[PDB]
């Protein structure tokens, strides 16, 4: 695992929120799964049974591998607890591979899908409260000497519209119930007696059915599933801890707060109307990704400074404003 | 599996081709490799083929030997002894092979697409691209003087691409050879999977030659094919892939029941173009630049502009011209 | 491969040549060249491609000894006594190297083209391209000078070419050698291919030197030349894929029938353009020349706004001086 | 290594730089002691031995060792004097090694992530400023030769009411530290162990193994590498017990900034003279310590500082020495 | 063999050379090249390139020390009895390496001609190109006044090569390089093809040092040279390969028969040149220079102009002055 | 060695300080790797003899308990002592770990270093060129503020030490590393090369009354040699990079050569270079005397000078010749 150890080096020289969560719901089943396989540790197939010494090399290798097939055939077995133990034995690994995809998924169906309508319309707002910024700031000038809500009525107009509302929830929901899903899972593989491995199997078909040379069976072990029962753990904890925060991201609308318009509800060139709450609609999450990159506009710094100016009350918003320029 | 693993770190920390059509590609050409590949995992495929519990008497390379004469010996279907057959046998050795074959097979329609039928249609968005921007532009010229040529030739390329059907013949025909390579795979997988597990545990007795005579060899050896029920749980998923992947390919072949927005509605409010979209109901290029238009419209900002004055003329506030000298775009 | 496949998932996520005969070079190397690679697969090569079955009695290292020395007696003819021939095990013995060095004398040809004929042909492309674009741009000051030299250049440019094949000799002398090697190669990879699927199990007796008269040794080993059934897969695997691809390459050759719908006449709706397209049954540069503008045809603009002209006039919805000047070009 | 190699060859060919050396060591340390426990050279086999009898086959002696190092897992079936625990700890040593790195290397990206962009843009705006109020006043002194509102530091007044940043980059160093401080004692409590874990008695003696006969009852069973998990992890811990009095250091919000930069600013008639920004629990404060982090970045800063350092030689009028300036 | 898969794979994803030369350096590297990766291919090569069979008695470490020491026994000619002699032994030991110094040689030339030749041919090129592009625009410029100094520079820069024998000589001596380097290369690739074959399989007695009076060994071991037959088949592939580039040297060490094609002839049309082509095969430089301005004139967009033009004057139908004024 | 060798391959086809950090860092580095090359590492790292009757893998568990013994003091049977064992069995990990002592100066510093000098490299470089073309600009007006301002900021410097400081520190802590490796290194060296052949007894547990097992065996760690000769390298390489640092240190009398002097000619440009003798940042900084190649109108400085130097010509006259 130095490939890892690069990726760090080169570490070392969407919402947060659900990037954060990518992060983790990915990197965590995948680190895993590369540790289990990891070369230093993947010393050993678990197919260990010793067939008495008699047995040949190569027909030990034999007892090995039929044992490791059989794990499928039912019927070829003798276990106490079942074989779907054994199967979540051997494809525990692919098991773990093709939960992480899934986990990835979502981000996928979101990134291909780049929320075009609202990629757009973040530039749009930013370039709205832009000029309104800028008819503010020339109206005071020339005071110191069109007009349609466009931005609040885009907002109107979000206020109907919630189908990326309804992507964002169903990505997170999707996500929601991926994680639940493996979780179970993950403490069911882990839910194991971890007496499974050490069954006993008798490879006495064909020709080797009537065969005498042949032992009447064999106790083969499936080994690392004490490295599977760890590693399983390890990611049921991170799980368990990763779901309140998809619950707390789920909940949007409890979460859109600190309105930014506030400030520029201040502006005479502006529409006085925060107007942004209480909605399962666009608005909520085009308000969301305002307050994440709201920073980005220079102009946002600036009302943000009038506003604690403001709160400061030493000026008025004409003579402080028209100072700002 | 370090590629993998390197492909989502780095995943950690114009279009061309269809969203729906380029994801379907992706996945219908990586789960089979992907398979493949976490299959062909030492760690996970370390033994060989198939071990065959010859007699201790036999050598170590006696041993090799038998192992490697019967897992050669699967192609003669005369050399072996099995009820299944000998293609059951044949598909074991050649699973991977097979699938690699099967995955090439769908790599083909994107690449030909890419190489030849995609350029011309970049080429027809970009020029559709340019005209709607130059419109946009003059109208809101126009509308400035109003504050203060004329030949609908946009809309002639589309009538024209009315009755241009190639481009959509060759899409379509990437898209339906594309459902029926999946088909096919699909189909043969699932009889992959459908093989009783029961071939692995075949007999073969290499006598041929002074080998027909030779008295220390036994009579035969149990030979079982190993990783047949891994090649058979990787067979099911992947059939689960493309089982889930068709329904897709075929809604993605439905050009005309794509069901999608006027986009020219939004341009259908400049006076300097003509109220007319008339772009559906045809088994031509016309659907398809049609989908091509509502995919790669966010390219152009001027659409972006045309979509805000419809929804503020959806809000039904301001009149249209006046609200175009508004946006001064 | 593991890392060979890694690589082709990642790719995922001027033409200067005939697309055509870029495609073919293409699928022409990679079936080899894939298929060479999947003979040094770890899932597929097992391991060495010989094994012998020597008496137990033999050592380790004997064992090891005997069959390599078999193998290398395959190329000693008088000492491997096969039914079948020395022959047969010169083929599947080096079947691997034959289709490797094939494959690179069918990646000659195109090398030597692109090396030689090509930028003689991206001049010429660009000459024509800049006479296009002149042209149009001549045509377009006149039709707003109207709306206020003239010498038939590219017209001579393809007189020129009608006259000389030189570089139409080496197209088609480049194509025709390669379709000679894929004739070759497809009878070569056939014959392979037949052959009696027996023949590999041979009977090898290194009794050379003191091993002649010596005693402990057998008289002869039956030794097996592996994956012998993975070769032939393969190689019908690559004989269709050529079967397959020559017709293309005929295809090719036929360059008049190739030649079709000449762009000239997408020109000739300029009067300052000359009327006679002259470019048909051109069995010289001329067609080549021809085929390579109709390919890259796409990529001059004003080929753009002359082909939505030519649809306008053949939707006939406006005068070509007209629509010309309204296009503004 | 061989990926070590690689950067360590093109070795010889905005966030705080303590705070990144921290985690830079933090992550190296034991990224590079885990790379060497898997090294070629170093790494020399399996991690178990019990040396079966010569009776027992060599396939069969495969076995044991293999059943018997999973056996670590098996508590009760185990013959340790230790118990299971020192032995669980070795059979999952470079495993805890790598959470604690990864968890280590987490808080940083929670950072560049979220108090990231906030102060980056915050940082862009007061720079701007800055650079904007020093043309005015060459400009101005400049006509003097031939608003006025302080901005910016209303900028930095408000920022002296809010502490979220503040309160982002404390919680990050104190988790950090908080990290530290478990890892460091989980370490030394693994070297700790007396080595003599490492060499104890298996018995596969379960099953048809339990009432086996032609098996021994057991095997002197030997975990391997301890002795090298034992060193690299007393390096570790070493480095760890270094690193968490600076982790402290740079937890220390009021004491490591020092040398207010807008004294060079305060040297201005348009801009006020006046720092008053210093002693708080308030991003103020921290805003303060990435303007003197990258204060150098700005040229007018650099201009500020020579001019002022000028005027402590006293040479020159501050208007004449602006106006030479001509910036 | 991956890598040069995967290389080839991604290949199907000015001049200051030659095409025929670059084509003979490029094969004279790859074929020998492509065959040695061939060599080391690890479905190809099967393993060990001596076995010997030493009897069962030999222990297995014993059995592998045998085999060692013969192998290097191949050189202290005396342990070996050869009835051909050691020399093939020591030929096929060194074979690939063998092949890599004829490769090592066969690329030296094209890099004496890179860099070595590099500033003539790429001054006299840019100089005479800017020549030729100015001739032109003043012969334009010209046509175009007259429908409305005088020196022969760029000819007397060729009457100049005339005298010059320089670079000249140094490409006619890479090319005589080359060629005796692969005339070598094939004789010692027919003689190496040339040993018996049977010489692969040698008889050694390792009886050295207290071996000399050893018991528990044998009088001999019977080695065989593995592989060598493969060794063969590529120093044939390589042999034919060869027998076909070095005609290819020949025709290319032909520099005056080769000049053709007189593209200054199509500048003789011109008014501000000059009527000299001043194209005559000699020992000169020039014929080169002469060569790469057939080879790169291409380049030269004029070019193609001065050919129309010359194509319209076959024609005979445009006078030049008009047809030149008709240039625009 | 193929990936180095590649490398310096393609290669093939303050700078004392910077040479010094990549030969200190790439020299062990380089050994290591050499050691760690499986060409080099022909066998494990110690194959130690036990009874032919016992078995493969006991054998195998017998160098493995062994190679774990050697740093049980109890278990091994030596006459040098564990520590022996101990260097032996760590001797690449502590090269390795020396290395990166020894890379870390360089990071640290070059962090610290980089917007400093460089900030104060592009100011100064900017007031000798906009001096230079003042006086370029007053020579032509002959043809037809006033203040000292990068002077100011060389007298400023020549306060401060801060920085210098810094660069004393990383030399001095490099030096240190340096010392201290060496001295490590002829001492694994200086080991009497016989600790290798040392007896185990792996008589623990169930192996003290084991009877089977022989009382113990001699074993042997390999490859001590190897380490040596490279331990010998590389101390040598050390003692010969080390006196460069020294040299290093008295930096401010390795200050020579003031570039200064040719901008003092100017007209422009007071005359006086005073930048000598002081533990400030003045000579760091001067060692601008560095990369000073970067101002093409310090090349036209130095011509004027060399000018001046013949004497055959006025400075403003030739001075405005070149412009
Ligand atoms: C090289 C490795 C280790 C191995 O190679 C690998 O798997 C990779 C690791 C490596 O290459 O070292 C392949 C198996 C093998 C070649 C192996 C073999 O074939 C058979 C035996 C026999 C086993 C035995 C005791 C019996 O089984 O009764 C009878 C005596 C005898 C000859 C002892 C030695 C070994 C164990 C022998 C020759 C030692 C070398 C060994």
């Avoid at 070392?12 to 983790?24: G, N, R």
């Avoid at 309105?259 to 005479?268: G, M, N, R, S």
């Avoid at 502006?270 to 909605?279: A, N, Q, T, Y």
Wanted: neutral net charge.
């Amino acid at each position: 695992a130095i490939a890892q150890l690069a990726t760090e080096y080169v570490f070392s020289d969407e919402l947060a929120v659900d990037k954060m969560v990518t992060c983790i719901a990915v990197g965590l089943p995948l680190l895993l799964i590369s540790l289990a396989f990891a070369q230093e540790i993947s010393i050993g197939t678990q197919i260990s049974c010793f067939s008495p010494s008699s047995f040949s090399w190569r027909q030990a290798a034999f007892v090995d591998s039929y044992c490791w097939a059989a794990v499928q055939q039912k019927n070829s077995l003798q276990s106490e607890s079942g074989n779907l133990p054994l199967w979540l034995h051997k494809f525990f690994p692919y098991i773990l591979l093709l939960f992480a995809i899934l986990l990835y998924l979502p981000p996928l169906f979101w990134r291909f899908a780049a929320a075009p309508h609202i990629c757009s319309d973040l530039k749009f707002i930013m370039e709205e409260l832009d000029k309104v910024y800028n008819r503010a700031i020339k109206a005071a000038k020339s005071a110191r000497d069109f007009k349609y809500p466009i931005v609040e009525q885009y907002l109107k107009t979000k206020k109907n519209s919630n189908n990326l509302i309804i992507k964002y929830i169903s990505c997170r929901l999707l996500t929601l119930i991926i994680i639940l899903l493996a979780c179970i899972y993950l403490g069911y593989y882990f839910s194991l007696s971890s007496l499974s491995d050490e069954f006993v199997c008798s490879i006495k078909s064909g020709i080797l059915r009537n065969d005498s040379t042949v032992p009447d069976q064999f106790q083969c072990k499936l080994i690392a599933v004490g490295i599977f029962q760890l590693l399983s753990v390890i990611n049921l904890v991170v799980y368990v801890l990763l779901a309140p925060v998809v619950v707390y991201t789920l909940f949007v609308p409890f979460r859109q707060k600190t309105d930014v318009l506030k400030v520029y509800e201040i502006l005479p060139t502006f529409d006085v109307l925060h107007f942004k709450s209480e909605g399962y609609n666009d608005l909520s999450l085009y308000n969301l990704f305002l307050e994440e990159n709201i920073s980005e506009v220079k102009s946002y710094k600036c009302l943000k400074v009038l506003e604690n100016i403001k709160s400061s009350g030493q000026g008025i918003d004409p003579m402080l404003l028209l100072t700002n320029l």
